[PDB]
Amino acid sequence: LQAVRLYEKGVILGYKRSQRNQDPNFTLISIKNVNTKKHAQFYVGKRVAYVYRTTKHHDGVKIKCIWGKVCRTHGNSGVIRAKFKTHIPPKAFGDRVRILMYP
Amino acid sequence: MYKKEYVIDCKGHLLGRLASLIAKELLNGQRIVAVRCEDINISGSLYRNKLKYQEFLRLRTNTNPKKGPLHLREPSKILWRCVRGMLPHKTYKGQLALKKLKVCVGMPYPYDKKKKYVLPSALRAFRLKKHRRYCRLGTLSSRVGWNYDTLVKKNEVLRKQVSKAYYKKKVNNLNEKKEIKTEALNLINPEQRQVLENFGY
Amino acid sequence: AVKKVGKIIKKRTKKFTRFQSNRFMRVKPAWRKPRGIDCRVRRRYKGTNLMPSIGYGSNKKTKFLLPNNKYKYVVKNVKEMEPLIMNHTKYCVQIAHNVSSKKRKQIIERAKQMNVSVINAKARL
Amino acid sequence: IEDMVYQLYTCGPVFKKVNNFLWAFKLKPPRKGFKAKRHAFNEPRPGDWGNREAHINELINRMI
Amino acid sequence: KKRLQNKNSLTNFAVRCRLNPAYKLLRSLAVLRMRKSILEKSKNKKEKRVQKQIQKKELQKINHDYYKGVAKAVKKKKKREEKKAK
Amino acid sequence: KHYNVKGKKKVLVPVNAKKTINKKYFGRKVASKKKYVVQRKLRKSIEVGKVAIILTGKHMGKRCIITKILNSGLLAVVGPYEINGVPLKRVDSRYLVVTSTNIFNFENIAKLKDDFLNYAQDIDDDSFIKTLEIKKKQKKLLKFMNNVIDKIKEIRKEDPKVQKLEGIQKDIGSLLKPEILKNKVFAHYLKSKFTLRNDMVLHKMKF
RNA sequence: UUUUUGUUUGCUAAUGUAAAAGAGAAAUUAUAUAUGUACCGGUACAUAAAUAAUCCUAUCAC
RNA sequence: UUGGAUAAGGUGCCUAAAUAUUCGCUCAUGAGAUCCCAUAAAAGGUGUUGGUUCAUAUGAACUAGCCCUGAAAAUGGAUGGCGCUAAAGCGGAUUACCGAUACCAAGCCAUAAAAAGAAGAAAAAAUUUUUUUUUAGAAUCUUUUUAUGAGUAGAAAAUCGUGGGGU
RNA sequence: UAAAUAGUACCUGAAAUCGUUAAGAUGGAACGGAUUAAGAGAGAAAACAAGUAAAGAGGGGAAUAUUCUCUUCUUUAUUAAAAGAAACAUCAGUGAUUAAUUUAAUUUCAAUAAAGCAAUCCCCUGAAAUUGUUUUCACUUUCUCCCCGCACUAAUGUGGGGAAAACUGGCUUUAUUUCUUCAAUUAUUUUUUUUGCUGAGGAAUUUUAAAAUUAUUUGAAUUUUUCUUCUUAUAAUUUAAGUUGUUUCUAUACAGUACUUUCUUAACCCACUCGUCUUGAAAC
């Protein structure tokens, strides 16, 4: 009906990480229908929006977005690394991101 | 992973593989509901797994067994404990992941009327060579002290009868819809019919 | 984490605190190098109270200037503000704490007609 | 630099001087990794150390 | 002198020709050799292949001799083993 | 004007140099030492008649028709207002998914492509840039809400350079209206908004 | 219980989300086979066997 | 510090990365599972899998892989845990991947060393005339360059403060 | 009384410790490091607007108790500009990705359509007669025929024993390689798709010169030309000689729900009690 989406859904997994060590400059993101490195390479360079709600208004709006970008793939199973303007908080692990169709 | 909730028919799955897949899904944030936990399979003979559970039962804090490892005998709880062992349950995020999981024996009222999914990388039929021994979780639980196996079985046969009635009605409705569609396919304009025929509709 | 405001890089904020000053009242937070023997912080164990080191030093092209890209100069009367007559673009002024209200007003007006910015311009008024 | 290249490749009259004039190369880690630095290249198991003969070229290319 | 960006001496054409005064000539020659028309090669492939029949025969002969030598070693070792069986 | 090191022909265009820095010792100077820059080099699948999908504006998901390459890299686009409500809009190419269908590949529409090009050869970026004076007037009203919205609309309408845009919009839309309408399925295609269903995987589907 | 507006002396108007973007999908079972139908577990006939690699659902405003 | 790529080691979950690919072996009514390392032997097996040498597809005798017996301890318990048998075990092989404060490129701080040094207008904005910035020269200093940076005991330098005294 | 929160324990009045109010957290410690997020406090000195015209208050300097000039505030309208950020683009440095590619070497193959050769035979391969050489049979497909079991099979067939040519397979001659093949490895070269991160510096006598490129120009050379090379001169450019441009937003504000910052709370990962003697301390 209304509110076209034209973006691919993704989920914020943890940070770029080893066992017992974190690199919260990158975020691991899982994209909806991608399960392979070759397919994940497709959405490289696309902008990513972490859109989330907030208890009280900040510009007359209850919603704000953390902007980032897909930088490269991660592993073999279509997980990507995203670099955001600011490190997304670990409270957002498991939340939804938009892999936008632009650029 | 991207659904509001995934209902998994645990019949015929291997316990450890099912638990691993469920644990990863819960940590990634997917709510899953595991039904028919009494039909989970474990590789290895029933006697061997019974010995394993006896070793587990012999385990308790000798100063106060109330504090000890709570053993739990319902197969749904056995699956829940396995998933928890595959999980970082002592952190806040791990606890959230653990509490995103619901386990049932049989198929209760909401979940008997929703689509049940299956994990191919955890069916016994795909993961065990036929000439090797396995056990049924409900049977192990009954030998260990659950004594609700037969009740779940009869509830399941009643549910299967209800489901068969539903399936007959659904098949008849599908045939009726197919006939209506095939009649209507000659009433649309030939360009639309041609497009549908070309793309397989 | 580094913060950048234009050309100004502050390689670190949240200044270093003395080890165990959080959980001992007699230990003030002012940094002291832990001399110690099995001292954790001195040995640089992971996840505790890192020590300052010269590597954190800020770029010397922008080392001492304020968020207004100007070096602070503290003045006590109107006669200490003469050098700024030909440094007004790279120095900002700050009136010393123990300066009375008349000298404060005089300093503010002289700085304004020298168009030298004042940091604590609204104090004692 | 082409004179440098010639003298290095063909161990010509001026090799010691060119080689000494040249700062020691600082190579990157190999793109696909090593096999096992512990074991010889000539061991039947995967290994890396020892004389690689012409096989040094692909390793250098991955390390460059 | 102030340190500037170190240009890629391989892909930055101006600095590559600065370093190697012969490189632009060599590269133009290679490109011009590349630009030859496919008709000549298509029409001369058989001419350029049929010259090597004698080399192929000699090659077959040397590999045949090597295989025969290996087989004769096989036979000699088998004969010796049969000798020492009794 | 161009340069073709390694056989490339990058094509140069002039650049103004407005950023100013301070010199090391005495003066100030313009930082940019270059007078020419290599130009956009747009995507290959971008043609004049192609139908594209807008991704970002208030017309996200809307389908439009490419009109002109605007000498700055951005391209003018018209989702012909008479059929779609998408105005003559200058859109960045990389906020736009260009499909594989060209409007001028239809038999009835290919005839008037030359008329289309004649109409379109007078669009320019300055006519798209907001004029300083009308911007001032529009911000004046900020010192109820429906009234100020309507006044802003009216000021934009009275912009002396939006009027020429409205005129060329109107004539190009009148030029393309009948032939587009007579392709019944294609007219609905242009009028319908592109959305991403959960059965379409965009790393596998074609633009 | 339904509609409109809102949650921009210690208080007496008042907001929170671990996860909306089509969060779409109820048969059962076997895995060296199953499922439906019709007769008396058996017989016969159909169906299914990359099965979600599917289907269903979206824009035609006034 | 920002990127990149790796080492050791890993890629079923805990836990980032393979329920990867390819070929064998193993069923354990106390299987097994990363050097140091967290014990196991003599002696056995008509368990199974390959080899060897004698016997007119038979019978033997050997051999060595995995498995089994030999194999008993005190709070309840530990391949790290869950668990795993079309392995997530054992022996290989092929790839991809993940993975350091190490490596690479770049920035900045300091240390060491080095190259060098004891006077003139640049731009911009207004309107030919104005306006705005700057227009440098401290030798333990100024500009630029390269490499380098653990540290107890111990040593030194440069800095930061306190009482009081001259100026 | 200037002041009593200077009231005789009387100047100031710290910390430990306790009270009131408010805000928050709260599943067998608490605190912490690192990174953000949400709240709550503060804040404009960079975090927009210099000037211009008017009227109101003032202050100074020069000009012989009067003219010009400078300036600061209050208000109005009256216009710039700049700065930060974002997006896109360009260039450069450094990576990731996906398509290729010239010329050679290495027993490559494999097809097309007309002939021919051999038949347990052929490219092969095998078993047999102070080095070579020579020889024998034994090696294939059948959706062929015959016999026996004659339905016996895993089988829409089959087991055992024989005959057959020659489809299949192998070899030779000719023409072809876009019907089809042209591989793999290595040496030697040339490109290309989509993309991440970074932008030090600011050159008053080297950001020059050279190099490259473009447009004319002189001659030559040669791989013989729409990127062929070498210089002759001029003019420009940048691929040289470390990031620039455009458009928006902040915003036509004076401090807010924005931005900066402190604090308080969470959350992911990490984190044993310091001092000390000691080889070795979180130490029962």
From TrEMBL, chain B:
<dbReference type="GO" id="GO:0006412">
    <property type="term" value="P:translation"/>
</dbReference>
<keyword id="KW-0689">Ribosomal protein</keyword>
<dbReference type="GO" id="GO:0017148">
    <property type="term" value="P:negative regulation of translation"/>
</dbReference>
<dbReference type="GO" id="GO:0003735">
    <property type="term" value="F:structural constituent of ribosome"/>
</dbReference>
<keyword id="KW-0687">Ribonucleoprotein</keyword>
<dbReference type="InterPro" id="IPR036899">
    <property type="entry name" value="Ribosomal_uL13_sf"/>
</dbReference>
<dbReference type="InterPro" id="IPR005822">
    <property type="entry name" value="Ribosomal_uL13"/>
</dbReference>
<dbReference type="GO" id="GO:0005840">
    <property type="term" value="C:ribosome"/>
</dbReference>
<protein>
    <submittedName>
        <fullName>60S ribosomal protein L13, putative</fullName>
    </submittedName>
</protein>
<dbReference type="GO" id="GO:0003729">
    <property type="term" value="F:mRNA binding"/>
</dbReference>
<comment type="similarity">
    <text>Belongs to the universal ribosomal protein uL13 family.</text>
</comment>
<dbReference type="GO" id="GO:0022625">
    <property type="term" value="C:cytosolic large ribosomal subunit"/>
</dbReference>
UniProtKB/TrEMBL annotation, chain C:
<dbReference type="GO" id="GO:0003735">
    <property type="term" value="F:structural constituent of ribosome"/>
</dbReference>
<protein>
    <submittedName>
        <fullName>60S ribosomal protein L32</fullName>
    </submittedName>
</protein>
<dbReference type="GO" id="GO:0006412">
    <property type="term" value="P:translation"/>
</dbReference>
<comment type="similarity">
    <text>Belongs to the eukaryotic ribosomal protein eL32 family.</text>
</comment>
<keyword id="KW-0689">Ribosomal protein</keyword>
<dbReference type="InterPro" id="IPR036351">
    <property type="entry name" value="Ribosomal_eL32_sf"/>
</dbReference>
<dbReference type="Pfam" id="PF01655">
    <property type="entry name" value="Ribosomal_L32e"/>
</dbReference>
<dbReference type="GO" id="GO:0022625">
    <property type="term" value="C:cytosolic large ribosomal subunit"/>
</dbReference>
<dbReference type="InterPro" id="IPR001515">
    <property type="entry name" value="Ribosomal_eL32"/>
</dbReference>
<dbReference type="InterPro" id="IPR018263">
    <property type="entry name" value="Ribosomal_eL32_CS"/>
</dbReference>
<keyword id="KW-0687">Ribonucleoprotein</keyword>
From TrEMBL, chain E:
<protein>
    <recommendedName>
        <fullName>Large ribosomal subunit protein uL4</fullName>
    </recommendedName>
</protein>
<comment type="similarity">
    <text>Belongs to the universal ribosomal protein uL4 family.</text>
</comment>
<feature type="compositionally biased region" description="Basic residues">
    <location>
        <begin position="73"/>
        <end position="86"/>
    </location>
</feature>
Automatic annotation (TrEMBL), chain F:
<dbReference type="GO" id="GO:0003723">
    <property type="term" value="F:RNA binding"/>
</dbReference>
<protein>
    <submittedName>
        <fullName>60S ribosomal protein L6, putative</fullName>
    </submittedName>
</protein>
<dbReference type="GO" id="GO:0022625">
    <property type="term" value="C:cytosolic large ribosomal subunit"/>
</dbReference>
<dbReference type="InterPro" id="IPR000915">
    <property type="entry name" value="60S_ribosomal_eL6"/>
</dbReference>
<comment type="similarity">
    <text>Belongs to the eukaryotic ribosomal protein eL6 family.</text>
</comment>
<dbReference type="InterPro" id="IPR014722">
    <property type="entry name" value="Rib_uL2_dom2"/>
</dbReference>
<dbReference type="InterPro" id="IPR008991">
    <property type="entry name" value="Translation_prot_SH3-like_sf"/>
</dbReference>
<keyword id="KW-0689">Ribosomal protein</keyword>
<keyword id="KW-0687">Ribonucleoprotein</keyword>
<dbReference type="GO" id="GO:0002181">
    <property type="term" value="P:cytoplasmic translation"/>
</dbReference>
<dbReference type="Pfam" id="PF01159">
    <property type="entry name" value="Ribosomal_L6e"/>
</dbReference>
<dbReference type="GO" id="GO:0003735">
    <property type="term" value="F:structural constituent of ribosome"/>
</dbReference>
